[PDB]
Write a protein that binds this ligand. Structure first.
Ligand SMILES: Nc1ncnc2c1ncn2[C@@H]1O[C@H](CSCC[C@H](N)C(=O)O)[C@@H](O)[C@H]1O
Ligand SMILES: N[C@@H](CC(=O)O)C(=O)O
Ligand SMILES: [Ca+2]
Ligand code: NA
Ligand code: NA
Length: 374
C-alpha cells in the first residue's frame, strides 16, 4: 500500500512537469521509437547541459533528472512537494540518498518514455558496470512498431508473454481493456507491477500473472492479439546466461517454436501474433523462416517477417563473449570467443544474424510467407 501511494505521487509529479513531453523533445521524433538506449552513460552529460542551459536549471526538473540519468539533487533545493516524494522514493529503493542525507540521486531504475507510456527500466543496461536484471532493447520497440493499433477493439483479448518491464503489455493497454502480462522472474514481475500503476492501470484492465510461457500456451484462454519477445539467444554448451537472455533448444529458438506451434489453438480465428528474435541464418535469410512453411500449409496462416538489422556472425562473437564473461563473473583468460565461433559454425550454421519481427495471422484470406529485407 505505501508503494502504491508512492507510485501515484510519482505519476502526479511526472504529469506536473510534463515528463513525457520533455523526454520526447530531448530524443526527438526520429529517435523516440528506434531504441530505448538514447539516454545512456554516453549521452547523460549532454542531457544535463540541456536541462542546465535550455531549461535554465529550474528546480522543478531536479527530481526528474534523478530519475532520468541519476544526477544528484540537493535535498534542500527540491521544491517542497517534490521533497516529500523524493523521500518516499528513497524509502522504496527507487532513488538513493547520499550518506549524509543532503542529496538524492539515482538507484537502479531509469525513467524513460516509450510508445506513449512512462516506464521505469533497469538503469544498469545503459549506465554503470553491473549486469542488469530486467531486459529492454531495440528489439522490444520494433516488435511493437509493426502492430496496427487502429485494428484493436476495446473488447479484444490480448496477451504479452514474457513481459519484462511491461512495455508491450502497457502499449496494448492503450487500445484494449483486456491485457494479460506474464513472466516468471521476481525482478521483472515487481517492475511491471510498478509500471502498471505508473500508467494508471490496475487489475481491472491488465492482469499480471506469474506463469511459465508453455503453461499459458497450453491453457484454454483464447486471444485476439499476442506479443512475445522471449529469451532467444543461443549460448555454447556449458555456459550459463540469464533468465531474460538464454533461449531453449539446441539453437536458442525453442520458445519461438513453442509459441508458433500453439498459435492455431490459442489465437481466435483471424487473430494476430507479433514475435521478435535475432535469428541465425545464411546469406539468403534466417533459418527459422523455413520452419514456418509448415504453418502456412498446415494452418492457412499469413506470416510476415520484417528484417530490420543484419550482422555477420563474426560481429556478434565479442558481444556474446562479453555478456557471458560478465554474467558469470568469469576471468579474462578463458577463450570464450573460440567456443562461440565454433558453436555458431557447427550448431547454429550462423553466417549472419537477422533481427526479425514476425507477424502471424490465423485463418488468413491471403495465406503465405512474406520476408521483407532491404
Ligand atoms: N519460461 C518463461 N516463461 C515466462 N517468462 C519467461 C520465461 N523465461 C524467461 N522469461 C522472461 O522473459 C523475458 C524476456 S525479455 C523481454 C521483455 C519485454 N517483453 C521486452 O520486449 O522488452 C524476461 O523478462 C524473462 O524473465
Ligand atoms: N535494399 C537493398 C538494395 C535493393 O535491393 O534495392 C540493400 O540494402
Ligand atoms: Ca538529443
Ligand atoms: Na553525470
Ligand atoms: Na528476447
Amino acid at each position: 500500500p505505501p508503494l502504491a501511494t508512492t507510485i501515484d505521487r510519482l505519476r502526479d509529479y511526472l504529469d506536473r512537469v510534463g515528463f513525457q513531453q520533455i523526454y520526447k523533445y530531448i530524443v526527438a521524433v526520429n529517435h523516440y521509437a528506434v531504441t530505448p538506449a538514447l539516454i545512456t552513460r554516453n549521452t547523460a552529460a549532454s542531457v544535463h547541459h540541456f536541462f542546465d542551459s535550455r531549461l535554465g536549471g529550474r528546480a522543478e526538473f531536479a527530481l526528474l533528472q534523478c530519475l532520468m540519468t541519476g544526477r544528484p539533487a540537493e535535498h534542500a533545493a527540491l521544491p517542497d512537494k517534490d521533497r516529500a516524494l523524493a523521500d518516499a522514493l528513497v524509502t522504496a529503493g527507487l532513488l538513493r540518498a547520499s550518506p549524509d542525507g543532503r542529496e538524492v540521486s539515482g538507484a537502479d531504475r531509469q525513467l524513460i518514455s516509450a510508445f506513449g507510456v512512462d516506464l521505469l527500466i533497469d538503469r544498469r543496461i545503459h549506465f554503470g558496470g553491473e549486469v542488469h536484471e530486467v531486459f529492454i532493447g531495440p528489439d522490444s520497440y520494433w516488435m511493437l512498431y509493426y502492430i496496427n493499433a487502429s485494428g484493436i477493439a476495446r473488447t479484444h483479448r490480448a496477451v504479452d508473454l514474457c513481459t519484462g518491464s511491461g512495455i508491450a503489455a502497457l502499449y496494448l493497454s492503450l487500445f484494449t481493456d483486456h491485457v494479460l502480462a506474464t513472466d516468471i522472474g521476481d525482478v521483472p514481475l515487481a517492475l511491471v507491477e510498478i509500471n502498471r500503476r505508473l500508467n494508471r492501470r490496475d487489475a481491472g484492465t491488465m492482469e499480471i500473472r506469474r506463469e511459465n510461457l508453455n503453461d499459458t500456451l497450453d491453457g484454454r484462454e483464447r486471444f485476439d492479439l499476442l506479443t512475445c519477445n522471449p529469451p532467444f539467444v543461443a549460448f555454447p554448451p556449458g555456459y550459463s546466461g540469464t533468465l531474460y537472455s538464454q533461449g531453449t533448444g539446441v539453437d536458442g529458438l525453442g520458445y519461438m517454436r513453442d509459441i508458433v506451434g500453439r498459435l492455431p489453438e490459442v489465437l481466435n480465428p483471424g487473430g494476430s501474433a507479433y514475435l521478435v528474435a535475432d535469428l541465425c541464418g545464411d546469406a539468403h535469410g534466417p533459418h527459422f523462416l523455413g520452419e514456418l512453411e509448415s504453418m502456412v500449409t498446415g494452418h492457412g496462416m499469413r506470416i510476415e517477417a520484417f528484417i530490420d538489422h543484419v550482422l555477420p556472425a563474426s560481429a556478434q562473437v565479442g558481444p556474446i563473449s562479453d555478456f557471458l564473461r560478465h554474467a558469470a563473473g568469469l576471468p579474462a583468460d578463458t577463450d570464450i570467443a573460440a567456443d562461440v565461433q565454433a558453436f555458431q559454425r557447427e550448431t547454429l550454421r550462423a553466417d549472419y544474424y537477422y533481427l526479425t519481427t514476425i507477424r502471424l495471422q490465423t485463418a488468413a484470406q491471403n495465406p503465405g510467407l512474406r520476408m521483407l529485407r532491404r
